[PDB]
């Protein structure tokens, strides 16, 4: 219930800091990180025997209401 | 893959020069249930690493079959040789 005891993160308990300053009047921030993980298959056996990692495809989107300036 | 490269290079680099104990290579296909005696092709080993495989290593090899592995070597064949072989 209270901030000092809740177990979960919420929109009201987080601040988004860019270049040392807090972002004002954002609406959502969402981040996708995909490793391009792929399994290694084989003749004679139908199932893959390990996964391996290709490219660190890492992204964050910021959506914000336009401050009158700044 | 480095050990594979070193093995192929030991079989190929001192093949025409120096001397190699083995005369051929035994190629075992447990998955296909087939066996053959092989020698490096003229195309030979080909290794390549690519953009969309930053951590991996791909190998491409071609071989030529000397013959079936179940048969014996030409030099290790015994003829009939009935009677004396040496005309004394």
Residues of B in contact with A53 (CB under 8 A): 55
Q: Residue B72: CB partners within 8 Å, gap ≥ 6?
A: none
The separation between CA B52 and the C-alpha centre of its own chain, rounded to angstroms, equals 32
By three-state DSSP, how is residue A39 classified? strand
In this structure, the number of other CB atoms found within 10 A of the CB of residue A64 comes to: 13
Residues of chain B neighbouring A52 (CB-CB closer than 8 A): 55-56
Q: Which of B33, B45, B37, B55 is nearest to B8 (CA)?
A: B45
Helix (H, G, I), strand (E, B) or coil at A58: strand
Backbone φ/ψ region at A16: left (φ over 0), alpha (ψ -120 to 50), beta:
beta
Counting DSSP H helices and E strands in chain B, the numbers are: 1, 5
Cα distance from A34 to chain B (closest Cα, Å)?
Answer: 14
Report the candidate in B87, B66, B86 with the shortest Cα–Cα distance to residue B75: B66
Resolution (A): 4.5
Rounded-to-10 torsion of CA A22, A24, A25, A29: -40
Element (H, E) at B6: helix B2-12
Task: Please give, rounded to a whole number of angstroms, the shortest distance from the CA of A39 to a CA of chain B.
Answer: 12
Count CB pairs under 8 A between chains A and B.
11
Q: Which residues in chain A precede a discontinuity of more than 2.5 Å between C and N?
A: none
Q: Give B56's contacts in chain A (Cβ within 8 Å).
A: 52
d(CA A47, CA B15) in angstroms, rounded, equals 39
Return the CA Rg of chain A: 21
Q: Are B22 and B39 in contact (CB under 8 A)?
A: no
φ, ψ for residue B7 (rounded to 5)? -65, -50
């Amino acid at each position: 219930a209270s901030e000092a005891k809740q177990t979960v993160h919420t929109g009201n308990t987080v601040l988004l800091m860019i270049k040392g300053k807090p972002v004002g009047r954002a609406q959502s921030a969402s981040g996708q990180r995909e490793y391009g993980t792929t399994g290694v298959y084989e003749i004679g056996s139908i199932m893959p025997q390990e996964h391996v990692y290709l490219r660190y495809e890492g992204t964050i989107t910021v959506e914000r209401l336009r401050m009158k300036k700044e | 893959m480095e050990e594979l490269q070193s093995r192929v290079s030991e079989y190929a680099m001192q093949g025409g020069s120096g001397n190699v104990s083995g005369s051929y290579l035994q190629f075992f296909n447990f998955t296909d249930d087939s066996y053959y005696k092989v020698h490096l092709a003229p195309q030979g080993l080909k290794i390549t690493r690519s953009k969309d495989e930053p951590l991996l290593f791909r190998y491409e090899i071609t071989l030529v079959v000397i013959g079936s592995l179940t048969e014996a070597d030409r030099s290790a064949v015994t003829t009939e040789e009935f009677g004396n072989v040496k005309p004394n």
